Amino acid sequence: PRTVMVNLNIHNDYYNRSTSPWNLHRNEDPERYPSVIWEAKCRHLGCINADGNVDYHMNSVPIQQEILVLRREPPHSPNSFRLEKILVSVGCTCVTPI
């Protein structure tokens, strides 16, 4: 066990023009800290071209990143957690299919 103390009191539209734009989706888990995680969902299957139209010869893909979260241990505990890895979507990029 590597138990440390953590003080949870935190110290102190641009991407709308993307060819692979995204919206935010609320992921809520009461057994986790942070309980609310905003994930990116690509608006389209294709990428928006210069004309403002969707081109399906390319794909908008979510960028999946491993992040660390705190899991309540034992369950429902207000003050004790275990570090845990989860995969979250942090944005979208445009890719040329294989």
Place this chain on the structure above:
Amino acid sequence: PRTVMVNLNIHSDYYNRSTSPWNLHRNEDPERYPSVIWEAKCRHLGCINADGNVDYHMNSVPIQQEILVLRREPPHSPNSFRLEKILVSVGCTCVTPI
């Protein structure tokens, strides 16, 4: 102070095809947990077009996300931290300039 206990013991080649590709940069901070954060740096100023060439009519931009990290409190403490917000580049997207 909202002090909790945390047990720190936990129980990419597709994005190479991006029109706004990026490389990973190691961001190391001994006063922070995680000490190592992999940050995205856009490979080009422009985006890769259908011909496979870097096209400057569009821009590769880094996607910045606010990320929570643990800051050693007091400084150099091996087992006590305070939650803190930083901005991290997690990937690149292609945008149409304004």
